[PDB]
Design a protein around this ligand. Structure first.
Ligand SMILES: CC(C)CCC[C@@H](C)[C@H]1CC[C@H]2[C@@H]3CC=C4C[C@@H](OC(=O)CCC(=O)O)CC[C@]4(C)[C@H]3CC[C@]12C
Ligand SMILES: CCCCCCCCCCO[C@@H]1O[C@H](CO)[C@@H](O[C@H]2O[C@H](CO)[C@@H](O)[C@H](O)[C@H]2O)[C@H](O)[C@H]1O
Ligand SMILES: CC(C)CCC[C@@H](C)[C@H]1CC[C@H]2[C@@H]3CC=C4C[C@@H](O)CC[C@]4(C)[C@H]3CC[C@]12C
Ligand SMILES: O=C(O)[C@H]1CCCN(CCC=C(c2ccccc2)c2ccccc2)C1
Ligand SMILES: O=C(O)[C@H]1CCCN(CCC=C(c2ccccc2)c2ccccc2)C1
Ligand SMILES: [Cl-]
Ligand code: NA
Ligand code: NA
Lengths: 219, 536, 214
């Protein structure tokens, strides 16, 4: 019944500043220390800052001290993390975790907010449909693809037929290559159901106001 | 900024155990059990211990470790409006050393008197004796025991004094004993806790050697079991009586001695992250445990008196200095190898006293050394001036009427004052400083906040606790009386001034520190109710 | 700073078997202060074990913890598929608080050869100056696959983007995408494009291909 929801978080130029917020609910916020744990894109967890229940005792990571400011609004029940002088090493997902008793660890964690520090600019993707080869009809099950190339920053959402093709689909994580991401997804289906029925990949990229449908057609 | 710290962790525990395990562990607890329903008295005793005593014991230990300063610097840093709590409390323990130390000298005087083959309090045919001397205790007041006449007519010479106005000659053999006491207190307290925490190894552990062999000796005499019966056979009718609940409440508060700024002082030298909660639970159990062990030591001997010596039980089952200075020594003199048992008994008494007096003095030193840097530098010089004042005015209690001087200070100087001071101490930390800020402080040290039990006890039970004790202590007030003697009306009034001289500095320092701080009224209050930490 | 490192880093066991994993500290930690966290892929961490041994709310009884000083360990008595995750240890006795290197627990499974599909550049990408040929390698085990691109018979080694999926939670399998990117001028100047996958399930590589004419 305890819920922690992280707000804020986005793309920032190096040196810039952003404030993250965690909206707590389901418990008396005023008697629980809180901490911010960040997870790098290489998946390693690093504690950032702890603030006591009444805000009178504060601890910081050395990697982060002098640049970050942690605070509570014990009236409105919100945790904050004011950030400044941001560098690219600060790129991580930021977690809001409750830990009052040191002997019991972090009871609950928020579902995270994502910060990206980069000097690279936002770029909408090109969504290419991937249809099988011409001489490949001699087959039992058919495999379709969808190529989402050259976008920044993350994330992207990819579905097939508006989400009703959940089975037999592999959507591969994006790989950053020279300041742009490329992602791809594959769905496989019985030969009877394609090209007879229709299959389309739906790609969204809210950072650039991109909603694009590309339908897979033979060649 | 860099405060000293205990050379070892045992130094702290033994010197806290020392301060808490004193003479009332042996001369009141066993009496209250025999008086209030035997083993059944353990129920209101244990409950007042759980909700009243232990929570106040825990609270001061954590306050000292957290704020890292003596009594008067710490209370100013918690609630500046209540900085007077520090002064009242350092004055209370200042007065306490004007009389409480004489009981250690009495034990040493009996110790040096025990270096013989036939102990002198046995028979009724001496210089000091009267015709109405009898061998052992009776219930008729005009006819005293040989041990009672030895104490009043040889050790004290109290019979040669007509009251408080007539102190008479200064008994120089006891001025010597009081000097040996103050000398022992000096060369253990002048170099700070580096030496204090080591001397307390003898003084806080010796009572357990003495209790052990006196427990064996005591439990192997005819009638030993009959004493354990009077001690413990339950009579749950007592539980219903509101007196025995206030008797338990009063004993639990006094036996732990919280709020005098000495537990605070000892804890101020702890490491900030030391598990003060564990320490509070451990040492406090050892205190009440020792009282339980001691009751067997005392009442095993008491039943031996009733069985083989022919005394009515209620005539010897007494409390206070009367028990350890006439009743128990009378029984010792009848058993084989008597002068051995007397020697380690009186040394147990003295080592039970030095411990607790170390704390009361340390509360004064640490509170002054932490507020006045003039004093912090010249310590071993300053405590020489302290113990020289203690000895000089202490000569009043070494006179022939010296017991009259002792009795007056005992029922005025510190009893009512400390109950008022600690009552304001409870409200400062729980209602102005706030249980929130306090519990959060404890979490930063030991890693977890104190449970809500400790919080409800600090906020609600402890004020009612201290009022329960004080109300029943005022219901029992009567103008001062010792034996047939009644004190003059001026001597009663002078006792109230001593009681007020400390307490008066709660509002005196309040209105002073209030008036001398700038702003409008609310501005002045919030200034003097914002703690020191919240401003740094 | 107290550095906690865990071993093994990645670890595959089949369901049923015992699973033991360790967490070592560069400096000693009190038993009251060492905890364990489970984090499933794409989700937040969940407190799993606190104070060395104590299971958290909802943690099944097959889990256990033991250790002291600088050596601690998590143990699953008989493992299950729902236990596939990454486990982090954490010390809470000294600031800065530190988390462990982590241990990824993955499921063992029968060997399985990939299903390779080759894809030429689309009509739309070729209108702009680019051409990307995509090779999907789907539903294989174990995880290590080795792609190889050839253009008219010669091995082509630059301009490639490989991506692996997480282990599938249904059939405990792995898939991998590989994208080779060229200019349209570059692409429209060669004929055959081959994608060869080298997996443990075969000495000979699996080969899929297409010619530009179709
Ligand atoms: C007669 C002699 C041998 C011993 C006398 C008995 C006492 C030493 C015992 C009996 C009752 C005990 C107390 C009864 C109740 C508790 C409550 C317990 O409190 C909690 O668990 C707090 C809840 C929380 O931390 O959230 C802590 C120990 C304490 C104070 C006990 C400490 C030791 C006490 C006073
Ligand atoms: C650590 C240093 C040790 C010595 C220095 C300080 C000791 C202070 C003790 C006070 O002296 C008292 O003076 C009485 C004067 O006589 C002694 O004799 C009294 O007690 C004896 C008991 O046998 C009788 O025989 C004597 O006649 C009777 O006078 C008495 O015992 C003794 O306590
Ligand atoms: C007379 C008989 C019945 C009682 C014997 C009890 C004695 C042995 C007990 C009572 C108090 C105990 C002490 C309490 C405190 C500590 C602190 C601990 O860190 C070291 C041991 C030490 C110093 C204990 C030594 C053993 C001890 C002295
Ligand atoms: O001998 C004993 O049992 C010991 C018990 C432990 C404490 N020490 C000295 C403290 C004396 C107090 C006191 C201090 C703080 C709180 C309560 C009581 C006092 C107060 C008034 C009169 C006499 C003594 C006496
Ligand atoms: O026994 C005796 O002759 C005297 C001998 C010296 C010590 N004094 C203690 C007086 C203080 C008490 C008290 C003790 C016993 C009964 C009533 C009160 C107290 C208790 C708690 C708080 C404040 C004061 C009792
Ligand atoms: Cl007691
Ligand atoms: Na006591
Ligand atoms: Na003592």
């Amino acid at each position: 019944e305890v819920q922690l929801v992280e707000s804020g978080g986005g793309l920032v130029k190096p040196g810039g500043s952003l404030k993250l917020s965690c909206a707590a609910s389901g418990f008396t916020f005023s008697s629980y220390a809180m901490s911010w744990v960040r997870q790098s894109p290489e998946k390693r967890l690093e504690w950032v800052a702890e603030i006591s229940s009444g805000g009178r005792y504060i601890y910081y990571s050395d990697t982060v001290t002098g640049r970050f400011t942690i605070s509570r609004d014990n009236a409105r029940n919100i945790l904050h993390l004011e950030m400044s002088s941001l560098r690219s090493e600060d790129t991580a997902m930021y977690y809001c975790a409750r830990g009052e008793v040191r002997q019991r660890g972090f009871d609950y964690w928020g579902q995270g907010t994502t910060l990206t520090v980069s000097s690279a600019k936002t770029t909408a993707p090109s969504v290419y449909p991937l249809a099988p080869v011409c001489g490949d009809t001699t087959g039992s099950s058919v495999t379709l693809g969808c190529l989402v190339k050259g976008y920044f920053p993350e994330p992207v959402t990819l579905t097939w037929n508006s989400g009703s093709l959940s089975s037999g689909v592999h959507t591969f994580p994006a790989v950053l290559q020279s300041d742009l991401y490329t992602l791809s997804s594959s769905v496989t289906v019985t030969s009877s159901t394609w090209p007879s029925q229709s299959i389309t990949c739906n790609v969204a990229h809210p950072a650039s106001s991109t909603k694009v449908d590309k339908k897979i057609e033979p060649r | 900024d860099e405060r000293e710290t205990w050379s070892g962790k045992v130094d702290f525990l033994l010197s806290v155990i020392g301060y808490a395990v004193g003479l009332a562990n042996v001369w009141r607890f066993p009496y209250l059990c025999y008086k209030n329903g035997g083993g059944a008295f353990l129920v209101p005793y244990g409950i007042m211990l759980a909700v009243g005593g232990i929570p106040l014991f825990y609270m001061e230990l954590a306050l000292g470790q957290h704020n890292r300063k003596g009594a008067i610097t710490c209370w100013g840093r918690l609630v500046p409006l209540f900085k007077g709590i520090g002064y009242a409390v350092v004055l209370i323990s200042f007065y306490l050393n004007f009389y409480y130390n004489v009981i250690i000298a009495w034990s040493l005087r009996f110790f040096f008197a025990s270096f013989t083959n036939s102990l002198p309090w046995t028979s009724c045919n001496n210089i000091w004796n009267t015709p109405n001397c009898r061998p052992f205790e009776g219930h008729v007041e005009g006819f005293q025991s040989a041990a009672s006449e030895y104490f009043n007519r040889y050790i004290l010479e109290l019979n040669r004094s007509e009251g408080i106005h007539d102190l008479g000659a200064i008994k120089w053999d006891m001025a010597l004993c009081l000097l040996i006491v103050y000398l022992i207190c000096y060369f253990s307290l002048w170099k700070g806790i580096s030496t204090s925490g080591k001397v307390v190894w003898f003084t806080a552990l010796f009572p357990y050697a003495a209790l052990l062999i006196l427990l064996i000796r005591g439990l192997t005499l005819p009638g030993s079991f009959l004493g354990i019966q009077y001690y413990l056979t339950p009579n749950f009718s007592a539980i219903y009586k509101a007196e025995v609940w206030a008797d338990a409440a009063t004993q639990v508060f006094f036996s732990l001695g919280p709020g005098l700024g000495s537990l605070l002082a000892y804890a101020s030298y702890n490491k900030y992250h030391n598990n003060v909660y564990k320490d509070a639970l451990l040492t406090s159990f050892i205190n009440s445990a020792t009282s339980f062990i001691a009751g067997f030591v005392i009442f095993s001997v008491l039943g031996y008196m009733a069985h083989t010596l022919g005394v009515r039980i209620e005539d010897v089952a007494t409390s206070g200095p009367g028990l350890v200075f006439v009743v128990y020594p009378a029984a010792i003199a009848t058993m084989p190898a008597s002068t051995f048992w007397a020697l380690i008994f009186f040394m147990m008494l003295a080592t039970l006293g030095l411990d607790s007096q170390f704390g009361t003095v340390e509360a004064i030193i640490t509170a002054l050394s932490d507020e006045f840097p003039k004093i912090k530098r010249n310590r071993e010089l300053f405590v020489a001036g302290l113990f020289s004042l203690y000895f000089v005015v202490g000569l009043a209690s070494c006179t022939q009427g010296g017991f009259y001087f002792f009795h007056l200070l005992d029922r005025y100087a510190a009893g009512y004052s400390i109950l008022v001071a600690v009552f304001f101490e409870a409200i400062a930390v729980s209602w102005i400083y706030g249980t929130n800020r306090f519990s959060e402080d404890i979490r930063d040290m030991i890693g977890f906040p104190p449970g809500r039990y400790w919080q409800v006890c600090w906020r609600f039970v402890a004020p009612i606790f201290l009022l329960f004790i004080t109300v029943y202590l005022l219901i029992g007030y009567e103008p001062l009386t010792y034996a047939d003697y009644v004190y003059p009306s001026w001597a009663n009034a002078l006792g109230w001034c001593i009681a007020g001289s400390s307490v008066v500095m709660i509002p005196a320092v309040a209105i002073f520190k209030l008036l001398s701080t700038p702003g409008s009224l609310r501005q002045r209050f919030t200034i003097l109710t914002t703690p020191w930490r919240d401003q740094q | 700073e107290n550095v906690l490192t865990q071993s093994p880093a990645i670890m595959s066991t089949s369901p049923g078997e015992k699973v033991t994993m360790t967490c070592r500290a560069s400096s000693s930690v009190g038993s009251s202060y060492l905890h364990w966290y489970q984090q499933k892929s794409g989700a937040s961490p969940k407190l799993w074990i606190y104070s060395t041994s104590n299971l958290a709310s909802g943690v099944p009884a097959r889990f256990s913890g033991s250790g002291s000083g600088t050596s601690y360990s998590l143990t699953i008595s008989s493992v299950e598929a729902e236990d596939a995750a990454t486990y982090y240890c954490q010390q809470f006795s000294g600031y800065p608080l530190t988390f462990g290197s982590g241990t990824k627990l993955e499921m063992k499974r029968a060997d399985a050869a990939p299903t390779v599909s080759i894809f030429p550049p689309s009509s739309e990408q070729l209108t702009s100056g680019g051409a990307s040929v995509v090779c999907f390698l789907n539903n294989f085990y174990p995880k290590d696959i080795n792609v190889k691109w050839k253009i008219d018979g010669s091995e082509r080694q630059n301009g490639v983007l490989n991506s692996w999926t997480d282990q599938d939670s249904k059939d405990s399998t792995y898939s991998m995408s590989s994208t080779l990117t060229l200019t349209k001028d570059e692409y429209e100047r060669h004929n055959s494009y081959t994608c060869e996958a080298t997996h443990k399930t075969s000495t000979s590589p699996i080969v899929k291909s297409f010619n530009r004419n179709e």
